[PDB]
């Protein structure tokens with residue numbers, strides 16, 4: 001008896017959230033803490049206590065936060081900046097550990113693979129940071145000519161997927177191979193910015209991507225064969241995608257005109273539900289530790305938490 005609430009369970013106010021499609025401003029940690037980048041500050045919200053901590057604020061004018069990403073075990077937070085910095089923060093003692101520089105432009109995307117932090121920049125380059133050592137910059141992946149707005153390591157760490165405003169999807173190897181730091185695959189089918197990038201948690205080599213306003217499609221790939229398994233028209237820009245193993249489904253966030261979230265059944269790609277409420281385009285989606293709740297951040301300066309994947313007794 002699958003009951004999906006058509007409304008959110010809770011709404012958080014996100015004043016001054018930056019309405020920039022290419023930034024990745026929210027992330028839900030394994031310890032149940034949402035990190036939210038509001039203009040030039042990062043706020044942490046405990047989903048357990050409802051408590052808020054202002055972790056940091058930029059000190060120079062013009063500066064703003066361009067990305068946030070939790071480390072796997074949820075005690076450290078990576079923060080990308082418009083000044084091309086990748087900062088590492090210890091949230092427990094509430095102090096900055098590192099201010100890693102190496103990029104030439106704002107860092108809009110982040111993704112952890114254990115002790116390796118990968119960062120995407122407006123410049124088009126991707127950097128691997130070994131956050132444990134002095135010379136953190138240990139690699140450079142260059143396969144985009146525009147901003148890297150999507151960046152995601154596979155759960156098993158065997159691939160890194162990147163999506164850009166140059167309409168390309170690149171699948172990179174976990175380490176340099178017979179070709180060095182060159183993509184294993186490059187997909188060109190999308191005709192718009194690819195910010196949505198998510199790996200299937202129960203299928204190692206399966207990747208889902210989503211295109212922007214001029215594409216409007218969700219595409220499923222097998223990154224070994226390099227085949228497109230499916231191309232579904234969503235009739236709206238696709239900003240993020242998340243998988244749920246609870247019922248084996250996908251959820252995507254969208255913009256004009258409905259600004260809705262859509263739940264799809266996998267692998268049929270049948271439309272299961274539409275979640276309406278946001279009054280401006282959705283920007284990002286993040287998932288709670290237990291997988292039951294999805295947080296959607298939108299240009300309407302709210303964060304809507306949807307209990308859409310709960311396993312009811």
Ligand SMILES: Cc1ncc([N+](=O)[O-])n1CCOC(=O)N[C@@H](Nc1ncccn1)C(Cl)(Cl)Cl
Pocket residue numbers: 011012013014015036038043044045050052303
């Ligand atoms: C310091 C503070 N306490 C509540 C709010 N506020 O404006 O709501 N502020 C301003 C900073 O902004 C947020 O802290 N936004 C938060 N939203 C929120 N909304 C209602 C209840 C608790 N938190 C998150 Cl998005 Cl969770 Cl970080």
